[PDB]
UniProtKB/Swiss-Prot annotation, chains A, B:
Homotetramer. Probably forms heterotetramers with TRPV6. Interacts with TRPV6. Interacts with S100A10 and probably with the ANAX2-S100A10 heterotetramer. The interaction with S100A10 is required for the trafficking to the plasma membrane. Interacts with calmodulin. Interacts with BSPRY, which results in its inactivation. GO terms for molecular function: calcium channel activity; calmodulin binding; identical protein binding; metal ion binding. It comes from Oryctolagus cuniculus. ANK repeats lie at residues 16-46, 50-79, 88-117, 134-163, 167-197, 207-236. This is Transient receptor potential cation channel subfamily V member 5. The gene is Trpv5. The chain holds residues 29 to 638 of 730 of the full protein.
Length: 606, 606
C-alpha cells in the first residue's frame, strides 16, 4: 500500500545518496561527472532500488548536461528500462517526457531510445493509490502532460497511436481519463489529425467501451460536446434561429447489447448525469419520455395499483373460523383462527378469493421473471445501491415477491402463522408503489427526498434515539417493578417498557399518569428529564436538521430526478417489445444519407 | 407537429441536394452556375419540397453573387413565392431581410420584388411550436430583426405600415411581441417617425387590443415606460423634486367595456404584474385602493361576516325532535331526528329562524346574481385558475351557494338528510371568509401562502401519505382480525382501520394499547415501523419541506399580494354603482386641457 511505496521511495533515495555517480547525476556535479566517466573502472550499469539507471536520475531532476555526458559515456543506458516492481517498464524517456523538456527528448531520440516502451509498472496503473493516470506508452505521457511539440516529435520518430496498455486503453481513452484542462481537446484534435494514413474512435478497451462511451461514463462534458461538434451537421442558419442535425449512431446504440445511455445512467460518477442535459441527449430522452416513456409508465403504474388492490382484497377477506380451543385465560384475546386448507375453498366467495390468489401468484411470478435476470446482468451492488435505477424499490419488490411466495408455501402446506408474511408483504408491496412516483414531476423529487432521509439523517437519529430508549426504558423498569402492574402497565416488564418509551419518545401515546394512586416521585423526576432531553430537544432538532439538510440537497435531488427519468426510459425500452418502441430519430435512408439515424433541433441564439 | 416539421426540413434538404441548380445555389458554385444558367434547357422554375425557388436557397445560405446571377438569368423568380403548407407566402425577400444583408435587399428591390408579400405560412404564425414571431410582412421582419437601414429602404420602396397579418397584429404589436433588446424602442420610435402623412397606436388587433393594451398584457415594462414618456408632460422641475403630469386616457379606460388594468391583472403572463409597479399605475391603483377600495372592501367583509354569523345561528338552532322510532340496539346512538315541515315553523323562535333562513336564501341569490355572469364574461378556466382574481374562493363560494340552495330544496320537500349539505356548506362558506383577507397587509400574503401550499406541497405529501395509510391500514387489519374487537376496536373492520391509521399518522389520537390483555407482537413490530417511517420522518419532513419552500416563494407571494389588491380594486369598481366610484384623476376640462383626465406626481431625484 502507501507504506510500501514510501519504503520504496526512501530506499531509492538512499541508493542515489550512496552511489557517487547517481549522486553526481542528481546534484549536477559536472567535475565529479568528468572524474567518474573518465575512469573506465566505474560501473556504467549501476542500478538503484527500483533498478533505475543514471539517466533516470538525470531526467528525474531535469539535468540536461549530466544526461548528455551520460549518453557520451554510455549510449546503451538509453535502451535500458527499470526492472523492479513499482517501475517495471519505466525508461528515461517516460521521465523526460513527463518533466516537459524538449531538448532531453531530442537527446534520447537522437540516440534511438525505445518509443514504444510499455511502462507496465504498478505506479502507472489506474489505481486510487496513484494520483494520476498518464498511461504506459510515452505517447500517452506526452498527450496527457500537454506538450504538442513532444508528441509531434514522438509521432515523427515512430509512436504507433493504436497502442493499448493495461485495461486496454488507447491514447484517446487516457486523454479522456484526465481532469479537464484547456489543451485536452486540442491534444484530441491533434492526435486525430495524425489518424490519416476501424479508426481510433471505434476501438474499445478491455471493458468494451469506445472513447465516446468512456466519455459518457466518466462524466466529462467539454470533451463530449467537442466530440459532438464532429458528429453534427448544421442544416441552415436563417436569421437568429438555426436548424442543425445530430447523428445518433453512437448515442442511441440500437444494435449493441450495452448502450450508451445505460452506461451513462448506471455509472458511479456523479458528473455522468450532467451529460443527460447535453445538446443531443436531453431532447432525445425528452422525446423518448414524452411520446413513449410516460404513457407506458402510467399504464404499468395503473396495472401495479390494480394488482396491489387485488392482493389487498384477497388479504382482507382471509379465511377465518371460530376458535375450537377455549380461551379460559385473562390477558388472552383470540376469538378467530386460521382455517385449514380443506374448508378454505368451499363457497363462491372462496372461489373468487382462489382466482384472485392465483392472480396474485401469477403477478409474483411475472415480477420474478423480469427482475431476477438483471440482478446478474448488471452488478448486484450496482443494481441495489443506485438511487437512479431504483435500487431500494427493487429490493423491496424482490422481498415482497419472496414473502408472498412464502405465503403460498404456508398456505399449500398447513402451517399456522400466515399473519406475519402477509404483514411484511402487505407493508412492503404497498410501499413499493412509490417506485412509480418517479414518472411525475410533483411526486418524484419528494420520493427521492424521502429516500435521502431514510439513508441519511434518520439512521443517525435512530442510533442515538435507541440509546435513549434503552437507558430510559431500563430506568422506567427500575422505577416501576416495585409497583402494582394493574394500575400502570406501561412498564410492567422490559419489552413493553422498551416499546412504551419508544412510543412516548415520539409523543404518540400520552404520559402515564394515574391520579387515583400515588406514583413514585422519581418517575416524575426521570420523566421530567425524559421530557427535557429526549422529546423536547431531539424530536425538534430532527425537524431542524431535516430543514437544514433540505435546502442543501434540494438542487441535487432536483437534478437527480431528471437523471432517473432517463433511467426509467432506458429501462422501459429493451423490456417492452420492439413493436411498442420504434427507433427514435429521423431515418437517413429515406433521404439518402447512408443508413444513419439523425435528430434535428432548432436553437435560437442572439 | 415537430416530427412533421422535421420531415419537411429533411425533405427540402433532400430536394436541394438532388437538384443541381439548387445545390450550386446552396454551395455558391459559380462555375457550375455559369454552366447551368448558360444552358437554355435548364428549368429556371425549379421548386423544392416547400416550393422554394433558387433565390430562396441563395438567400437562405446568404449567397449574394449566386443570387445576382439568378436575377440576371431570371428576374421573374423575384416575384415568385413558395407554395406549400409550412411556407405559404414566403418569398426570397423575407429570407433576405431576416438574414440581415442590405445589398441583397437592394438587389431584390432593384428588380421590383413584392414589398407587401403576406407570408401567411404556418411557420410564421404565433405558435408555441415556432421559436419566434416575426410577423408576416417584410416590414415586420425588418422591424423585429433590428436593421434600421433595411426598414428605411422598405418604407422608401413602399411598405404600407398599417398592415395587419393573421391575428390582426400591426408592426407595433409584433415589435411589442418580442424578447426585450436594445433596439426595440428605437425601432418603435423610427416606425412612429414614419407615421406622419386613427393612428398606429390606436388600431386594435383581432383580440381588440391596442399596442398599449398588448404591452400591458404581455408584461414588458421597458416598452411600457417608453410609451409613457410620450404620454406624460413635466410641469416643473424646481430644485431636486419635479412635478410631472401623466395622462390616464389609455390607462383608466373609463368608457370602454374591457379596461387596461383588468387586462393586466387577468393575464397568463407572470411579468404583467410588474406593470402594476410602474410610475403612473402604482400611484393610480394606490389612490384608488386607499380612498375607495379598502373602506368598501371592509364594508363588504363586515356584511359577509354578519351574513355568515346569521347562517351559523340558523344552523345551530335547527328544528330537532325526539325520535319516534325506538333504538333497541347497541352501537346505535341517535336520540333526536329532523322535524317535518308541518311543525318546523310553529313558535316565535321558529319565526325568527324563518326570517333568518329567508335572509340566508336571499344572500345566496344575491351571491349567484353577481358571480354567475362573470363565469361567462371572462373565461371560466381564467376565472377559476387565477390566484390573483380569487379563483378557489370563487369556486367554494359557488359551491356554498349551491349547497345552501340544495338545503332549501331538501327543506321545502320533506327529505331526510339536511346534515350533508349543511355540513359541507357550513365548512365551505366559513372557509370562504378568507377571501376578504386579501385587503389587509397582515392577512393577505398568509392567505395566498396557504393557497400555495394547498395546491403545492400538500398534494405531493397526501399521495404518498395515502399510500402509507392504505398499506399500514391493510396490515393493521390483518394483525387484528383474529382478535376480540371489544378490547381494541381501532382496527375492527377496514374503513375504521383506514380512518384510524389516518388518525394516528398525524398523532392526533393515541396509539392503541391495552395493558390488561396481550396484543399481538407483530402489531408491535409493524407499529414500530409505522412510528419510524411514517410519523417520525414524513410528519417532520413535511415541516422541513414547507420551511424550504417558504423562503423561496416568499418574494413571489409578497409581489403577488400587491398584484391581487389591484384585482380587488378593479373588481370593486364596475360592480358597485358609479355614484360610489368617482373617476380617478384630475379633470383637464376645468383647466382647459381638452377633455382628458390626468394624474400628477412629485418625484425627488438627486
Amino acid at each position: 500500500w502507501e507504506q510500501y511505496r514510501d519504503r520504496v521511495n526512501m530506499l531509492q533515495q538512499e541508493r542515489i545518496r550512496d552511489s557517487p555517480l547517481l549522486q553526481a547525476a542528481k546534484e549536477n556535479d559536472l567535475r565529479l561527472l568528468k572524474i567518474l566517466l573518465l575512469n573506465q573502472s566505474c560501473d556504467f550499469q549501476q542500478r538503484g532500488a527500483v533498478g533505475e539507471t543514471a539517466l533516470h536520475v538525470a531526467a528525474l531532476y531535469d539535468n540536461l548536461e549530466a544526461a548528455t555526458l551520460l549518453m557520451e559515456a554510455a549510449p546503451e543506458l538509453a535502451k535500458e528500462p527499470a526492472l523492479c516492481e513499482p517501475f517495471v517498464g519505466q525508461t528515461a524517456l517516460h521521465i523526460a517526457v513527463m518533466n516537459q523538456n524538449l531538448n532531453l527528448v531530442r537527446a534520447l531520440l537522437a540516440r534511438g531510445a525505445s518509443v514504444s516502451a510499455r511502462a507496465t509498472g504498478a505506479a502507472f496503473r489506474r489505481s486510487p493509490h496513484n494520483l494520476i493516470y498518464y498511461g504506459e506508452h510515452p505517447l500517452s505521457f506526452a498527450a496527457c502532460v500537454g506538450s504538442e511539440e513532444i508528441v509531434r516529435l514522438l509521432i515523427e520518430h515512430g509512436a504507433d497511436i493504436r497502442a493499448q496498455d493495461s485495461l486496454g486503453n488507447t491514447v484517446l481513452h487516457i486523454l479522456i481519463l484526465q481532469p479537464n484542462k484547456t489543451f485536452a481537446c486540442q491534444m484530441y484534435n491533434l492526435l486525430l489529425s495524425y489518424d490519416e494514413h476501424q479508426s481510433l474512435e471505434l476501438v474499445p478497451n478491455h471493458q468494451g467501451l469506445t472513447p465516446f462511451k468512456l466519455a459518457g461514463v466518466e462524466g466529462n462534458t467539454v470533451m463530449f460536446q467537442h466530440l459532438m461538434q464532429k458528429r453534427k451537421h448544421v442544416q441552415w442558419t436563417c436569421g437568429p434561429l438555426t436548424s442543425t442535425l445530430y447523428d445518433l449512431t453512437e448515442i442511441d446504440s440500437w444494435g449493441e447489447e450495452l448502450s450508451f445511455l445505460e452506461l451513462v445512467v448506471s455509472s458511479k460518477k456523479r458528473e455522468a448525469r450532467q451529460i443527460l442535459e447535453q445538446t443531443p441527449v436531453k431532447e432525445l430522452v425528452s422525446f423518448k419520455w414524452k411520446k413513449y416513456g410516460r404513457p407506458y409508465f402510467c399504464v404499468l403504474a395503473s396495472l401495479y395499483i390494480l394488482y396491489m388492490i387485488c392482493f389487498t382484497t384477497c388479504c382482507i377477506y382471509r379465511p377465518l373460523k371460530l376458535r375450537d380451543d377455549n380461551r379460559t385465560d385473562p390477558r388472552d384475546i383470540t376469538i378467530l383462527q386460521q382455517k385449514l386448507l380443506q374448508e378454505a375453498y368451499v363457497t363462491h366467495q372462496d372461489n373468487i378469493r382462489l382466482v384472485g390468489e392465483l392472480v396474485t401468484v401469477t403477478g409474483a411470478v411475472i415480477i420474478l421473471l423480469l427482475e431476477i435476470p438483471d440482478i446478474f446482468r448488471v452488478g448486484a451492488s450496482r443494481y441495489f445501491g443506485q438511487t437512479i435505477l431504483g435500487g431500494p424499490f427493487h429490493v423491496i419488490i424482490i422481498t415482497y415477491a419472496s414473502l408472498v411466495l412464502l405465503t403460498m408455501v404456508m398456505r399449500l402446506t398447513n402451517m399456522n402463522g400466515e399473519v406475519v408474511p402477509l404483514s411484511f408483504a402487505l407493508v412492503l408491496g404497498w410501499c413499493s408503489v412509490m417506485y412509480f412516483a418517479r414518472g411525475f414531476q410533483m411526486l418524484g423529487p419528494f420520493t427521492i427526498m424521502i429516500q435521502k432521509m431514510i439513508f441519511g439523517d434518520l439512521m443517525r437519529f435512530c442510533w442515538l434515539m435507541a440509546v435513549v430508549i434503552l437507558g430510559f426504558a431500563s430506568a422506567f423498569h427500575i422505577t416501576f417493578q416495585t409497583e402494582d402492574p394493574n394500575n400502570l402497565g406501561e412498564f410492567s416488564d422490559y419489552p413493553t417498557a422498551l416499546f412504551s418509551t419508544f412510543e412516548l419518545f415520539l409523543t404518540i401515546i400520552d404520559g402515564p399518569a394515574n391520579y387515583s394512586v400515588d406514583l413514585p416521585f422519581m418517575y416524575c423526576i426521570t420523566y421530567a428529564a425524559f421530557a427535557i432531553i429526549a422529546t423536547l430537544l431531539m424530536l425538534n432538532l430532527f425537524i431542524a436538521m431535516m430543514g437544514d439538510t433540505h435546502w442543501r440537497v434540494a438542487q441535487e435531488r432536483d437534478e437527480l430526478w431528471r437523471a432517473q427519468v432517463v433511467a426509467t426510459t432506458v429501462m422501459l425500452e429493451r423490456k417492452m417489445p420492439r413493436f411498442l418502441w420504434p427507433r427514435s430519430g429521423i431515418c437517413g435512408y429515406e433521404y439518402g444519407l447512408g443508413d444513419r439515424w439523425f435528430l434535428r433541433v432548432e436553437n435560437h441564439h442572439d
